[PDB]
Design a protein around this ligand. Structure first.
Ligand SMILES: Nc1nc2[nH]cnc2c(=O)[nH]1
Ligand SMILES: Nc1nc2[nH]cnc2c(=O)[nH]1
Ligand SMILES: [Zn+2]
Ligand SMILES: [Zn+2]
Lengths: 365, 365
């Protein structure tokens, strides 16, 4: 009864947009942050992930195809049933993480040798029962010569067409899921343009900006976004893969990005870093040992309603699992509250002021 | 408004009893199992601990006096506030875990040298804000000569009197908390009798059987319980410290024990062992990789409502925190459901049949 995929832009401010993606398993409010999930968002039950405000999570073809295996997950009823998350899941395509390359695909050894190709990647994502399927692309190293960036991007575009065809051949997948293409081209405007043109000629439900989670720094990332995002179709979602810190997200939204994923909130949380509106803090630091305030005194999350910095400091220093649980829940909730403030401010025509106020306070520390 | 400590026996069957302990922070249904908590029941939020049915948890003087420190916990508002558990907490006294002994107390080095004595143990437990305070006792090694068991037990009884006096001197503690004595005497009936007599002459709110979590095996433990529990005052709770496996608990209840604590459900859970009515299972075993049944198909816990053996097998093999969370919640819930079945069967006059049926199925596997 519900739409397969319908993106609607409710409001804009500059290049920023806010809206919704309606899918069969739920609505995704944009700009959106996707928590990253080995068939788990680390240290969180799915109900807790949802309680933080997340509408969609990310799963990884590369990990799940090895453990527990794609056919096995399908036999067990699909990834949603397996992990107990009934809302949308976006799966990355696997070629990027895994990085022997050839025109056919990539061969690799598990940490046993396996192969991935556009066709196999689409099939794996089908067996998992993904809602948003990513085209199978190639990682371009950074830095790269223009010529190597070009040949990598061109192979990715041929693989994008193969991904489109494989997805469209599987009628249940094409009826129930969406397919996103991935723009490549390293930091080079002409290659980014050729990549955007190729992807739009194939046609996708959404367009990711790939190849920018590669250590280039925020200034260069923003420079590339400045020219790259306008090349993508305006009427489809724009997904910046693997980004990022809170300020990266704000600046990327200012440049027209609608969707994000990053391991930072989960990974940092486990390692004692909590995100706050006054910047990140390292909860293991001695200065928190008697601090009865919550991690952030404006955060609405359940952790900040119930436990102090002092307690969480104690747990993390003791290596206690509950410490990782509480830090991760707070960090994912912080990211979701950031996205909510972004959405509300764009809707209300005050996103420019929000971004300025956010940066002033976040970097004052 | 609520009672400091009121034990009522509602029903009996043989030596088994069922009833309630009313305290200021809540009611404890007996026979009771206390999950063990570094100011956390490992991998569980307090609300989850409560959702499993637990009425009371155990905390440890020895660990908390070093990390984060007893004065520090008191400055932060007490252990209940610090960890977010508002119901009763029983604290062990520290002398046992820590095991230089003298009549004054025990000196030890942290894994810095510290001292514990009856007076300091009571003070630490006061600073933590414990509801049930344990007398400061000595660990008798197993095996022990009769003479060494006697001298150890006698020192423990002198320390029990010092514990009583220190507790009674602190009027807020004596008004709001309860004090339990600990019977010692190794495996020797005459020493167990002398110990029970000394404790009853001092007078306590409850009586623990100490010195039986020492590797003697179930047959010998039961033999000692057979004569030791009847020596304790009938009208106060009987607490078997550090026990045990499900069958240990059932047999100990048959011998008049009302309260238990053990790390098994939490520790085993993290290491992949799940308790079921058909005995323990090792969820990492290959036989569970495609098993869509829950950990136990009769268990009422939230884990068994929502996730399969196959998923939990995957999580534990992957080293995922959620695996430890789910295993621990299920195991603590299993223990609580065991206690509930024990309480109901005693109340209904069918505990003998329950124990027989339980053992037949648990050991059939
Ligand atoms: N498939 C894919 N995933 C990514 N995650 C971060 N960057 C990328 C990329 O370029 N491609
Ligand atoms: N204090 C104390 N704690 C225990 N836990 C298990 N056995 C004992 C004991 O004999 N004394
Ligand atoms: Zn928070
Ligand atoms: Zn269960």
């Amino acid at each position: 009864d519900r739409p397969r995929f319908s993106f609607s832009i409710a409001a804009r401010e500059g290049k920023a947009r806010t809206g919704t993606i309606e899918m069969k398993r739920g609505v995704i409010r944009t700009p959106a942050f996707m928590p990253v999930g080995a068939a788990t968002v680390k240290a969180l039950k799915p109900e807790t992930v949802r309680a933080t405000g997340a509408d969609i999570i990310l799963g990884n073809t590369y990990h799940l195809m090895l453990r527990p295996g794609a056919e096995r997950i399908a036999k067990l009823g699909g990834l949603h049933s397996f992990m107990g998350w009934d809302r949308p899941i976006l799966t990355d395509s696997g070629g990027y993480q895994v990085m022997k390359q050839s025109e056919e695909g990539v061969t690799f050894k598990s940490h046993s040798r396996h192969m991935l190709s556009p066709e196999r990647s689409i099939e794996i994502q089908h067996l998992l029962g993904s809602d948003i399927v990513m085209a199978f692309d190639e990682c371009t190293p950074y830095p790269a010569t223009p010529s190597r960036a070009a040949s990598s991007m061109e192979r990715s575009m041929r693989w994008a067409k193969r991904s489109r065809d494989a997805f469209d051949s599987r009628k249940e997948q094409a009826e129930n899921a969406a397919l996103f293409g991935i723009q490549q081209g390293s930091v080079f405007e002409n290659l980014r343009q050729q990549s955007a043109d190729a992807l739009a000629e194939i046609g996708f439900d959404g367009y990711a900006v790939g190849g920018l989670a590669v250590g280039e720094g925020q200034d260069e990332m923003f420079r590339v976004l400045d020219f790259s995002v306008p090349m993508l179709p305006d009427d489809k979602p724009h997904y910046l893969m693997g980004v990022g810190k809170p300020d990266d997200i704000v600046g990327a939204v200012e440049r027209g990005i609608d969707m994000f994923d990053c391991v930072l909130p989960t990974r940092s949380g486990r390692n004692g870093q909590a995100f706050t509106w006054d910047g990140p803090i390292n909860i293991r630091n001695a200065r928190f040992s008697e601090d009865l305030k919550p991690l952030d005194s404006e955060c609405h999350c359940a952790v900040c309603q119930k436990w102090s910095r002092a307690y969480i400091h104690h747990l993390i220093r003791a290596g206690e699992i509950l410490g990782a649980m509480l830090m991760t829940e707070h960090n994912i909730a912080f990211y979701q509250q950031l996205m909510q403030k972004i959405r509300d401010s764009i809707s209300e025509g005050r996103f420019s002021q929000f971004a300025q106020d956010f940066r002033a306070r976040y970097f004052a520390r």
